[PDB]
A paper describes a structure:
Caulobacter crescentus Tad (tight adherence) pili, part of the type IV pili family, are crucial for mechanosensing, surface adherence, bacteriophage (phage) adsorption, and cell-cycle regulation. Unlike other type IV pilins, Tad pilins lack the typical globular β sheet domain responsible for pilus assembly and phage binding. Furthermore, C. crescentus Tad pili are proposed as a phage receptor and indispensable for the infection of a single-stranded RNA (ssRNA) phage, ΦCb5 (14, 15). ΦCb5 carries a 3762-nt RNA genome encoding essential proteins, including a maturation protein (Mat), a coat protein (Coat), the β subunit of an RNA-dependent RNA replicase (Rep), and a lysis protein (Lys), with the gene lys embedded in the reading frame of the rep gene. In this study, we use single-particle cryo–electron microscopy (cryo-EM) to determine the molecular structure of the C. crescentus Tad pilus and comprehensively examine the molecular basis for the interaction between Tad pili and ΦCb5.
With our cryo-EM map of the ΦCb5 at a resolution of 2.7 Å, we reveal insights into the RNA packaging within the mature ΦCb5 virion and the arrangement of the Mat responsible for interacting with Tad pili. The ΦCb5 virion showcases a near-icosahedral spherical Coat shell of 89 Coat dimers with a diameter of around 290 Å, while a single Mat extends 30 Å beyond the shell. The gRNA adopts a defined conformation, presenting stem-loops to interact with the inner surface of the capsid. The Mat of ΦCb5 measures 135 Å long and 30 Å wide. It comprises a structural framework featuring a large β sheet including β strands β1 to β8, β10, and β11 and designated as the β region, as well as an α helix bundle, encompassing α helices α3 to α8 and designated as the α region. Positioned at a twofold axis of the capsid, the β region protrudes outward, while the α region penetrates deep into the capsid to bind the gRNA. In addition, we find that the N terminus of the Mat is exposed externally on the capsid, affording flexibility for potential protein tagging and engineering at this site. The gRNA density is overall gray except for the last 111 nucleotides (colored differently, including the last stem-loop of the replicase RNA gene and the 3′ untranslated region, or 3′UTR), which forms a four-way junction domain and interacts with the Mat. Stem-loop U1, the final RNA helix within the gRNA genome, engages in extensive interactions with the inner surface of Mat β region with its tip sandwiched between Mat and Coat dimer 2.
Residue numbers in the entry:
A (entry chain JR), B (entry chain JW), C (entry chain JQ), D (entry chain JL), E (entry chain JS), F (entry chain GO): 1 to 122
The structure:
Amino acid sequence: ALGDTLTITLGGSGGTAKVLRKINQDGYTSEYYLPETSSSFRAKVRHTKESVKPNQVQYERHNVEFTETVYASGSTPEFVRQAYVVIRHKVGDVSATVSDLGEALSFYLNEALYGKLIGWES
Amino acid sequence: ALGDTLTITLGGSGGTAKVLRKINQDGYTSEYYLPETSSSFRAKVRHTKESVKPNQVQYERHNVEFTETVYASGSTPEFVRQAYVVIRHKVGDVSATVSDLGEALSFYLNEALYGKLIGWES
Amino acid sequence: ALGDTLTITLGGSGGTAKVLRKINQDGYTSEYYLPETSSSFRAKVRHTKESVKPNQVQYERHNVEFTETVYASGSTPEFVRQAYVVIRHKVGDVSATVSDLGEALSFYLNEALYGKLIGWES
Amino acid sequence: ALGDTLTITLGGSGGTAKVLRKINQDGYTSEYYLPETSSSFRAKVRHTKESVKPNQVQYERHNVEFTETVYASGSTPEFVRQAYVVIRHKVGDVSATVSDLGEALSFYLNEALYGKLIGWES
Amino acid sequence: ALGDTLTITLGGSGGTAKVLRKINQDGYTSEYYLPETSSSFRAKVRHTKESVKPNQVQYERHNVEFTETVYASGSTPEFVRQAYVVIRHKVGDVSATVSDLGEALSFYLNEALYGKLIGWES
Amino acid sequence: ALGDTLTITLGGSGGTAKVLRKINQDGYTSEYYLPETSSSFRAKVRHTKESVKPNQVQYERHNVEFTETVYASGSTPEFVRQAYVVIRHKVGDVSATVSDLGEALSFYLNEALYGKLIGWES
Ligand SMILES: [Ca+2]
Ligand SMILES: [Ca+2]
Ligand SMILES: [Ca+2]
Ligand SMILES: [Ca+2]
Ligand SMILES: [Ca+2]
Ligand SMILES: [Ca+2]
Ligand SMILES: [Ca+2]
Ligand SMILES: [Ca+2]
Ligand SMILES: [Ca+2]
């Protein structure tokens, strides 16, 4: 129950806000979508357990995903851009400590690191 | 390159800083390590390319993850925490748009979003 | 979106108004309902997209459905009345032109023409 | 027996009227067609029963569809635009109600609705 | 289409307020959730139609269910506490009468009566 | 040990009073009855142990139901109305918090909630 719209601000805090709408909601998941003249945006949210095992620990998994598709033009076919995050932690763990992670990762990644990553600079 | 030491600031800005070190670099990927008495920190950065197929678009993938492990104490067994992201785009795509999408995804996620997401809100 | 309530004005403009309520949402579909002592109202909205084929044009379908149900009384058994529309167009098409075609189809249909169509003359 | 020409006013009551001509009349069915420099129009009208089998109500069907095609230009291949309505009701039913329903549906659909469906809102 | 949040006031009117959130609603049902340090709240709403058997009346079930669970602390293991209501009526009945019966049931229940029932006096 | 007469006020507070009479009580169960010219009223109360599972918590249930019957009149056959609630919790628990949960459930249901719930809203 995050809201009726999801706002995507391309270029970080730069600007160019996009406001997606629910399209679907099933199985603790959500669909967001919005089309434009030359492309479209899609947002996805999921939650899930892992299969129970006799004596190993039980975990829960979360992820969020963004996707953009650009329609074919000229002789160039159709292609998409994607970007998503995942979090995995044990059942019953402390919320604040797991929240420290993920947030640390988000603070880590910024424009320069994204540029370096694009350059295969491991 | 990307640096010899990586800093993880648990809790985002103004938090506690942990510094890792290079250990290995094989198979287009590199990993970082830091040991401690009660737990440890590890990081990996990897790049990969999907196989060529006679007629479809060719894509590149970037993945970055954080892992934290807690050693068993008393009755409590081993357990772990992770959090990672992936970026996927076509080989010839302009880098700036991919960077902008990644910056948007980074900006969206923050403490309130992580709390709600742990709350199983979809 | 589309609102929580859906209004049917039986008999076109200036007629009798019925107000259905949403009661479900699954599989990219929505359903509306209303109880009556002698009948019942349904309303359904469905969306669909065809899968990808090697070299073909990809299409999507939009459907809107109205149904009337009358409970069996005396000798007369159960029977229903129904009326629905469908829209189909390609993934990257321009919305405005499809909308204009839909407006044309809606404007062509009217009371006298329905009375003619029930007359079996092609 | 609708007439020797069928008129389609693109954009609803706005303007841009097209005039098709009958091409055929076979088996309770009719066709209309009109060629142009870069596109064509076509309309069809059909009526049918259903297969009978023991102790059920017997039903009727009226179908009307609009079809629009655009010829290949440059790299972009051919594609079509379609929009059609179907009416179903029982033999011997009262005509005025079957028209009041159906004309209510015609009144419901307009610019805003078609925009919503193209937006995938349900 | 109840709403985006549910309010539970423990101890009847004038008590402590608790706010639940959407997590899911697929099969005409709904489910709510909220976590706490030592407990969690869950609320679920269901609709169902009883099995059809020829030449007999048709009925409808509506169910509303509250659950509260407390996490184990030492020797004491998990244990749970729920209270739920059910309403059954025939299809096509009058809403007002069923509502009045339910209101009478609700008005009969109160502080003293729950104390008596938990006192086991038949 | 409730008493000799149970009062049902159809329509909640300020409604029409109906006084029932005790008829029987054998197995920790009690029921009340009243006949009428066109209907009939009945109430019941039950208590029971849940089955004992080796090395798990032990639970007990309190149940109460209202039933309303309308005799066949001409074409219309027999039909009935009901409304009942159930309480479950473990042995040795504190009665007052359980009363509080029942109080919350009872306070939630009222005019509007019943009106919307009978409309199949979920
Ligand atoms: Ca930028
Ligand atoms: Ca924090
Ligand atoms: Ca190496
Ligand atoms: Ca009319
Ligand atoms: Ca227009
Ligand atoms: Ca002919
Ligand atoms: Ca109290
Ligand atoms: Ca759903
Ligand atoms: Ca009332």
